[PDB]
């Protein structure tokens, strides 16, 4: 064809029932994720081309950066609860990978505070049970797909984006190609 299994995507030999339609996994420790977010804006360009009535889900993972990694997964859960993903994603990435000023849960908190979230409000969420189930989801969803690497995108629990089998000479072209593949899989 033009879109072949094993080429721009792979198929899960054990499909996942009830999965979010589009599901993306990242880590703030993950350099390609930094690239995916900061330079390419993958998640944004995928949105731009998805049909809609399509919901997009992004989760963080634990298996990178040990103790801090989990803290980051809890923090991302807080981001989701307060609806502030848009305001912390960049400063988290740059705190972890660029400036390297994030070394403790407290430093993570500083990003939120500087992003305008209120101390009381952050700590509240941080410890809230709603956040606890949101950590659970992120771990469950990753668990439901054998996830061992990031970035990673899944479409309806049956197809996994395979960016390695796509052209990278031109950034914009890689993104378009990525995005369109997501559309195609969406329509499958």
mmCIF file of C-alpha atoms in Angstrom:
data_model
loop_
_atom_site.group_PDB
_atom_site.id
_atom_site.type_symbol
_atom_site.label_atom_id
_atom_site.label_comp_id
_atom_site.label_asym_id
_atom_site.label_seq_id
_atom_site.Cartn_x
_atom_site.Cartn_y
_atom_site.Cartn_z
ATOM 1 C CA UNK A 1 0.000 0.000 0.000
ATOM 2 C CA UNK A 2 1.217 3.469 0.936
ATOM 3 C CA UNK A 3 0.641 2.897 4.635
ATOM 4 C CA UNK A 4 2.017 -0.488 5.650
ATOM 5 C CA UNK A 5 1.972 -2.206 8.950
ATOM 6 C CA UNK A 6 5.557 -2.376 10.161
ATOM 7 C CA UNK A 7 6.269 0.852 8.245
ATOM 8 C CA UNK A 8 4.635 3.981 9.677
ATOM 9 C CA UNK A 9 2.837 2.059 12.362
ATOM 10 C CA UNK A 10 2.871 -1.330 14.032
ATOM 11 C CA UNK A 11 -0.109 -3.346 15.136
ATOM 12 C CA UNK A 12 -0.609 -4.605 18.671
ATOM 13 C CA UNK A 13 -0.860 -8.379 18.711
ATOM 14 C CA UNK A 14 -2.858 -7.939 21.903
ATOM 15 C CA UNK A 15 -5.350 -5.092 21.226
ATOM 16 C CA UNK A 16 -6.560 -2.839 24.011
ATOM 17 C CA UNK A 17 -10.289 -2.512 24.703
ATOM 18 C CA UNK A 18 -11.748 0.780 25.924
ATOM 19 C CA UNK A 19 -8.574 2.751 25.203
ATOM 20 C CA UNK A 20 -8.619 6.499 24.520
ATOM 21 C CA UNK A 21 -8.847 7.143 20.802
ATOM 22 C CA UNK A 22 -5.518 8.934 20.518
ATOM 23 C CA UNK A 23 -3.091 8.271 23.365
ATOM 24 C CA UNK A 24 0.343 9.730 23.687
ATOM 25 C CA UNK A 25 3.087 8.873 26.186
ATOM 26 C CA UNK A 26 6.044 11.021 27.167
ATOM 27 C CA UNK A 27 8.597 11.750 29.877
ATOM 28 C CA UNK A 28 10.123 15.082 30.740
ATOM 29 C CA UNK A 29 13.399 13.180 30.889
ATOM 30 C CA UNK A 30 12.906 11.984 27.342
ATOM 31 C CA UNK A 31 15.011 13.994 24.858
ATOM 32 C CA UNK A 32 12.989 13.033 21.801
ATOM 33 C CA UNK A 33 9.897 14.102 23.769
ATOM 34 C CA UNK A 34 11.486 17.450 24.289
ATOM 35 C CA UNK A 35 12.081 17.572 20.557
ATOM 36 C CA UNK A 36 8.483 16.331 19.887
ATOM 37 C CA UNK A 37 7.008 19.032 22.069
ATOM 38 C CA UNK A 38 9.325 22.030 21.725
ATOM 39 C CA UNK A 39 10.587 21.822 18.165
ATOM 40 C CA UNK A 40 7.936 19.821 16.301
ATOM 41 C CA UNK A 41 4.670 20.359 18.233
ATOM 42 C CA UNK A 42 3.524 16.911 17.222
ATOM 43 C CA UNK A 43 0.540 16.779 19.530
ATOM 44 C CA UNK A 44 -0.600 20.065 18.219
ATOM 45 C CA UNK A 45 -0.338 19.192 14.599
ATOM 46 C CA UNK A 46 -2.025 15.887 15.115
ATOM 47 C CA UNK A 47 -4.985 17.682 16.695
ATOM 48 C CA UNK A 48 -5.085 20.071 13.703
ATOM 49 C CA UNK A 49 -5.669 17.108 11.346
ATOM 50 C CA UNK A 50 -7.733 14.694 13.411
ATOM 51 C CA UNK A 51 -11.440 14.487 12.555
ATOM 52 C CA UNK A 52 -13.272 15.689 15.551
ATOM 53 C CA UNK A 53 -15.434 14.155 18.097
ATOM 54 C CA UNK A 54 -11.880 12.932 18.560
ATOM 55 C CA UNK A 55 -10.404 13.251 22.011
ATOM 56 C CA UNK A 56 -6.633 13.459 22.536
ATOM 57 C CA UNK A 57 -4.991 12.043 25.649
ATOM 58 C CA UNK A 58 -1.424 12.608 26.813
ATOM 59 C CA UNK A 59 0.170 10.713 29.760
ATOM 60 C CA UNK A 60 3.523 10.813 31.549
ATOM 61 C CA UNK A 61 5.566 7.723 32.491
ATOM 62 C CA UNK A 62 7.611 6.496 35.454
ATOM 63 C CA UNK A 63 10.408 4.438 33.955
ATOM 64 C CA UNK A 64 12.674 7.452 33.385
ATOM 65 C CA UNK A 65 14.510 9.526 35.988
ATOM 66 C CA UNK A 66 13.772 7.287 38.976
ATOM 67 C CA UNK A 67 12.274 9.067 41.992
ATOM 68 C CA UNK A 68 11.873 12.345 40.187
ATOM 69 C CA UNK A 69 10.187 10.496 37.319
ATOM 70 C CA UNK A 70 7.306 9.440 39.547
ATOM 71 C CA UNK A 71 7.122 12.955 41.050
ATOM 72 C CA UNK A 72 6.786 14.171 37.514
ATOM 73 C CA UNK A 73 3.991 11.692 36.825
ATOM 74 C CA UNK A 74 2.137 12.909 39.921
ATOM 75 C CA UNK A 75 2.773 16.521 38.838
ATOM 76 C CA UNK A 76 1.469 15.887 35.345
ATOM 77 C CA UNK A 77 -1.590 14.396 37.010
ATOM 78 C CA UNK A 78 -1.971 17.717 38.863
ATOM 79 C CA UNK A 79 -1.616 19.528 35.555
ATOM 80 C CA UNK A 80 -4.507 17.516 34.130
ATOM 81 C CA UNK A 81 -6.759 18.086 37.124
ATOM 82 C CA UNK A 82 -6.237 21.833 37.135
ATOM 83 C CA UNK A 83 -6.232 22.062 33.314
ATOM 84 C CA UNK A 84 -2.861 23.741 33.170
ATOM 85 C CA UNK A 85 -0.918 21.400 30.909
ATOM 86 C CA UNK A 86 -0.540 24.253 28.500
ATOM 87 C CA UNK A 87 1.190 26.357 31.112
ATOM 88 C CA UNK A 88 3.695 23.917 32.626
ATOM 89 C CA UNK A 89 4.655 21.619 29.766
ATOM 90 C CA UNK A 90 7.367 23.882 28.434
ATOM 91 C CA UNK A 91 8.856 25.034 31.753
ATOM 92 C CA UNK A 92 8.951 21.446 32.988
ATOM 93 C CA UNK A 93 10.870 20.271 29.922
ATOM 94 C CA UNK A 94 13.298 23.124 30.138
ATOM 95 C CA UNK A 95 13.718 22.714 33.876
ATOM 96 C CA UNK A 96 14.569 19.037 33.496
ATOM 97 C CA UNK A 97 16.567 19.013 30.261
ATOM 98 C CA UNK A 98 17.858 22.556 29.469
ATOM 99 C CA UNK A 99 18.627 24.539 32.611
ATOM 100 C CA UNK A 100 18.585 21.526 34.963
ATOM 101 C CA UNK A 101 17.043 23.372 37.837
ATOM 102 C CA UNK A 102 14.528 20.657 38.606
ATOM 103 C CA UNK A 103 16.036 18.252 41.103
ATOM 104 C CA UNK A 104 13.339 17.730 43.684
ATOM 105 C CA UNK A 105 9.567 17.661 43.950
ATOM 106 C CA UNK A 106 9.879 21.134 45.402
ATOM 107 C CA UNK A 107 11.509 22.416 42.263
ATOM 108 C CA UNK A 108 8.650 20.934 40.258
ATOM 109 C CA UNK A 109 6.336 22.929 42.476
ATOM 110 C CA UNK A 110 8.256 26.134 41.740
ATOM 111 C CA UNK A 111 7.367 25.807 38.039
ATOM 112 C CA UNK A 112 3.661 25.682 38.827
ATOM 113 C CA UNK A 113 3.939 28.604 41.246
ATOM 114 C CA UNK A 114 5.756 30.726 38.701
ATOM 115 C CA UNK A 115 3.227 29.652 36.110
ATOM 116 C CA UNK A 116 0.629 31.197 38.338
ATOM 117 C CA UNK A 117 -0.932 28.249 40.123
ATOM 118 C CA UNK A 118 -1.573 29.035 43.785
ATOM 119 C CA UNK A 119 0.450 27.247 46.443
ATOM 120 C CA UNK A 120 -2.615 26.274 48.413
ATOM 121 C CA UNK A 121 -4.197 25.074 45.209
ATOM 122 C CA UNK A 122 -1.253 23.055 44.014
ATOM 123 C CA UNK A 123 -0.528 21.286 47.324
ATOM 124 C CA UNK A 124 -4.257 20.595 47.590
ATOM 125 C CA UNK A 125 -4.332 18.806 44.232
ATOM 126 C CA UNK A 126 -0.906 17.188 44.857
ATOM 127 C CA UNK A 127 -2.414 15.345 47.749
ATOM 128 C CA UNK A 128 -5.919 14.946 46.409
ATOM 129 C CA UNK A 129 -7.343 11.476 45.739
ATOM 130 C CA UNK A 130 -8.569 12.674 42.320
ATOM 131 C CA UNK A 131 -4.914 13.089 41.478
ATOM 132 C CA UNK A 132 -4.187 9.669 42.895
ATOM 133 C CA UNK A 133 -6.619 8.044 40.446
ATOM 134 C CA UNK A 134 -5.122 10.125 37.693
ATOM 135 C CA UNK A 135 -1.709 8.676 38.517
ATOM 136 C CA UNK A 136 -3.386 5.294 38.418
ATOM 137 C CA UNK A 137 -4.791 5.900 34.948
ATOM 138 C CA UNK A 138 -1.423 6.968 33.566
ATOM 139 C CA UNK A 139 0.178 3.883 34.996
ATOM 140 C CA UNK A 140 -2.701 1.626 33.895
ATOM 141 C CA UNK A 141 -2.782 2.910 30.324
ATOM 142 C CA UNK A 142 0.956 2.469 29.986
ATOM 143 C CA UNK A 143 0.660 -0.962 31.533
ATOM 144 C CA UNK A 144 -2.139 -1.945 29.154
ATOM 145 C CA UNK A 145 0.294 -1.510 26.215
ATOM 146 C CA UNK A 146 3.667 -3.017 27.369
ATOM 147 C CA UNK A 147 5.116 0.465 27.136
ATOM 148 C CA UNK A 148 8.922 0.420 27.403
ATOM 149 C CA UNK A 149 9.795 3.427 25.306
ATOM 150 C CA UNK A 150 8.790 7.046 24.790
ATOM 151 C CA UNK A 151 7.645 9.025 22.865
ATOM 152 C CA UNK A 152 4.883 6.710 21.935
ATOM 153 C CA UNK A 153 1.482 7.228 20.378
ATOM 154 C CA UNK A 154 -1.344 4.759 20.176
ATOM 155 C CA UNK A 155 -4.505 4.940 18.056
ATOM 156 C CA UNK A 156 -7.631 3.131 19.523
ATOM 157 C CA UNK A 157 -5.481 0.578 21.229
ATOM 158 C CA UNK A 158 -4.803 -1.250 18.005
ATOM 159 C CA UNK A 159 -2.083 0.780 16.253
ATOM 160 C CA UNK A 160 1.207 2.214 17.414
ATOM 161 C CA UNK A 161 2.930 5.028 15.558
ATOM 162 C CA UNK A 162 6.342 4.005 14.266
ATOM 163 C CA UNK A 163 8.223 7.231 13.650
ATOM 164 C CA UNK A 164 11.501 5.493 12.775
ATOM 165 C CA UNK A 165 10.017 4.368 9.449
ATOM 166 C CA UNK A 166 9.324 7.966 8.382
ATOM 167 C CA UNK A 167 11.408 10.633 6.591
ATOM 168 C CA UNK A 168 13.374 12.973 8.859
ATOM 169 C CA UNK A 169 15.379 15.135 6.442
ATOM 170 C CA UNK A 170 12.788 17.871 6.778
ATOM 171 C CA UNK A 171 11.137 18.593 10.142
ATOM 172 C CA UNK A 172 7.862 19.893 8.763
ATOM 173 C CA UNK A 173 7.624 16.912 6.466
ATOM 174 C CA UNK A 174 8.200 14.463 9.297
ATOM 175 C CA UNK A 175 5.397 16.108 11.300
ATOM 176 C CA UNK A 176 2.905 16.143 8.395
ATOM 177 C CA UNK A 177 3.700 12.528 7.655
ATOM 178 C CA UNK A 178 3.348 11.639 11.305
ATOM 179 C CA UNK A 179 0.114 13.530 11.573
ATOM 180 C CA UNK A 180 -1.466 12.105 8.454
ATOM 181 C CA UNK A 181 -0.590 8.620 9.591
ATOM 182 C CA UNK A 182 -2.462 9.298 12.813
ATOM 183 C CA UNK A 183 -5.418 10.460 10.711
ATOM 184 C CA UNK A 184 -5.334 7.350 8.586
ATOM 185 C CA UNK A 185 -5.153 5.045 11.593
ATOM 186 C CA UNK A 186 -7.967 7.041 13.145
ATOM 187 C CA UNK A 187 -10.164 6.256 10.127
ATOM 188 C CA UNK A 188 -9.340 2.561 10.082
#
